[PDB]
């Protein structure tokens, strides 16, 4: 089994830039789609960022343009460039990852991070 560690939250201005990083550990070979998702105070969970080992990406339409996920194998882990922050990407950023013998679902969490956009 893999865990998740997710870091590089906290508090920036409104039209601000943050990066958050999301370091996975043990069986790696067992990693193949990861993402991240956010949740914020209220509101369901949803999916924000996703990318397959190979560099495919995706991004829900509110976030697209302004955030960017991207890999580093060397390091296990995955980021999320948060440029031109609104107040409200308030939330938080939980790190995902899909395990290949069970694919289409989320295998492991991390234990989210919070992200607090100010006015």
């Known amino acids: 089994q893999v865990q998740l560690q997710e870091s590089g939250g906290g508090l920036v201005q409104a039209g601000g830039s943050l990066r958050l990083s999301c370091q996975a550990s043990?069986?790696?070979?067992?990693?193949?789609?990861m993402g991240w998702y956010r949740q914020a105070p209220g509101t369901q969970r949803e999916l924000v960022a996703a990318?397959?080992?190979?560099?495919?990406?995706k991004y829900a339409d509110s976030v697209k343009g302004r955030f960017t996920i991207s890999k580093d194998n060397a390091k296990n882990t995955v980021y999320l460039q948060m440029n031109s922050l609104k107040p409200e990407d308030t939330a938080v950023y939980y790190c995902?990852?899909?395990?290949?013998?069970?694919?289409?679902?989320?295998?492991?969490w991390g234990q989210g991070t919070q992200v607090t956009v100010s006015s």
């Open positions: 990318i397959t080992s190979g560099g495919s990406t």
């Open positions: 995902a990852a899909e395990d290949r013998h069970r694919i289409g679902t989320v295998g492991y």
């Open positions: 043990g069986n790696i070979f067992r990693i193949n789609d």
